[PDB]
């Protein structure tokens, strides 16, 4: 019968891929040490001080 030339319409309506919310980085101790370049094996050794007894 009648022929109509139509486009294929693409729409975005706010449907996204559900994906986790990030909380862990803010709670962990990040970068107390920075100069890993300049220490052998990329290892910085932390010194824990001493305690005596009377």
């Amino acid at each position: 019968a009648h022929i109509f030339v139509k486009p294929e319409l693409v729409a975005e309506i706010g449907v996204k891929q559900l994906q986790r919310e990030i909380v862990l980085p803010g709670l962990v101790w990040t970068n107390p040490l920075t100069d890993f370049g300049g220490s052998k094996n990329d290892t910085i050794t932390v010194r824990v001080p001493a305690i005596t007894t009377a």
Binding site: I51, T52, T53, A54
Partner: protein
């Protein structure tokens, strides 16, 4: 050195308090802990120990 002497003094006090001649020990039931402390207050009272500064 100062920390060691401070902890040794606290241990001296703790040994004094723990080594006192307690004729009996009040047994705390973990499921019902309050009656043990009411018993402790009672023992203090029947000995006519003043109620303040405990």
């Amino acid at each position: 050195q100062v920390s060691a002497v401070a902890y040794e003094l606290e241990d001296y006090i703790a040994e004094l308090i723990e080594g006192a001649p307690y004729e009996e020990t009040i047994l705390i039931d973990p499921a019902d802990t309050v009656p043990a402390f009411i018993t402790a207050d009672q023992r203090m009272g029947e000995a006519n120990v003043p109620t303040d500064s405990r």
